[PDB]
Amino acid sequence: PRRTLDSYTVKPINKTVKPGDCVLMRPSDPSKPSYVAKIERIESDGRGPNVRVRVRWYYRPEESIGGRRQFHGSKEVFLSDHYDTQSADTIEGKCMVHSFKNYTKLDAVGNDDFFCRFEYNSSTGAFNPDRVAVYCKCEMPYNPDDLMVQCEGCSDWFHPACIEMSAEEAKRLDHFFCENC
Amino acid sequence: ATKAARKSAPATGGVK
Ligand SMILES: [Zn+2]
Ligand SMILES: [Zn+2]
């Protein structure tokens, strides 16, 4: 006689969660980072002891078929088509999965702060969007963990390491021009 | 006590 719930309180964590909230779950392998998921629905055994949460998985970059790449953020996650059902007591705690822009905005990034720019197909490994804007001499996409400086000459952004330079030196500049200017 | 999460396999279904 299961009925969908409004919210559930998770005691061991001692926090309450709602459908749409982003949560971390304890992985089968304890030496691995916490699973990231989005709560679609919360369901109960009538009035009973057991509670189960149905989630839509966020895939970590090294958790996907393609594997982590150099332009993937440390706190990056993919929104996928993969849903399955897990019990509530998995929930290790809560997290925020930010849009790309709003991640950039954050003053400081919490252990629990993530971001998403891709949709992921767990079966095929295909991404949406297919392609993204690239920068610097590497012609790699933006990695928000990487410090970059702007040559207004080209208006392109460069990793200091890829352009003759130390990081500390790059931070100095107000006046930058790449070698093609 | 934090249960451990068991995930499924991509593109699979429950027969029941
Ligand atoms: Zn330039
Ligand atoms: Zn570069």
Numbering used by the authors:
A (entry chain A): 7 to 187
B (entry chain P): 21 to 36
Which text from the study accompanies this structure?
In Arabidopsis, the BAH and PHD dual domain-containing proteins SHORT LIFE (SHL) and EARLY BOLTING IN SHORT DAYS (EBS) function in chromatin-mediated floral repression and seed dormancy. Here, our biochemical and X-ray structural studies show that SHL is capable of recognizing an active histone mark H3K4me3 and a repressive mark H3K27me3 independently via its PHD and BAH domain, respectively. In this study, we identified SHL as a dual histone methyl-lysine reader that is distinct from other reader proteins in recognizing both H3K4me3 and H3K27me3, two well-known histone marks with opposing roles in balancing chromatin and transcriptional states. In contrast, the SHL from Populus trichocarpa (PtSHL), which has similar PHD and BAH domains and shows similar H3K4me3 and H3K27me3-binding affinities, successfully yielded crystals.
We further determined the structure of the PtSHL-H3(20–36)K27me3 complex at 3.2 Å resolution. The peptide adopts a right angle-like conformation with a sharp turn at H3A31 and is bound within a negatively charged surface cleft on the BAH domain. In detail, the interaction features the recognition of the H3K27me3 trimethyllysine by a classical aromatic cage formed by Tyr41, Trp63, and Tyr65, similar to other canonical methyl-lysine readers. Interestingly, the side chain hydroxyl group of H3S28 is anchored and fixed between PtSHL His88 and Asp90 and forms two hydrogen bonds with them. The interaction between H3S28 and PtSHL His88 fixes the side chain rotamer of His88, locking the conformation of the imidazole ring of His88 in a parallel alignment with the prolyl ring of H3P30 with the alignment stabilized by hydrophobic and CH–π interactions. Although H3K9 and H3K27 share the ARKS consensus motif, H3P30 at the n + 3 position of H3K27me3 (but not H3G12 at the n + 3 position of H3K9me3) can be specifically recognized by PtSHL, suggesting a sequence-specific recognition mechanism. Mutations of His88 (H88A) or Asp90 (D90A) involved in H3P30 recognition as well as mutations of the aromatic residues responsible for H3K27me3 recognition (Y41A, W63A, Y65A), abolished the binding of PtSHL with H3K27me3. In addition, Arg32, Asp90, Gln92, and Asp95 form several hydrogen bonds with the main chain of the bound H3K27me3 peptide. The superposition of the two complexes yields an RMSD of 0.94 Å, suggesting a nearly identical overall structures. Moreover, the binding between 2-fold excess H3(1–15)K4me3 pre-saturated PtSHL and H3(20–36)K27me3 yielded a binding affinity of 18.7 μM, similar to the 21.3 μM binding between PtSHL and H3K27me3, suggesting that the recognition of H3K4me3 by the PHD finger and the recognition of H3K27me3 by the BAH domain are independent of each other.
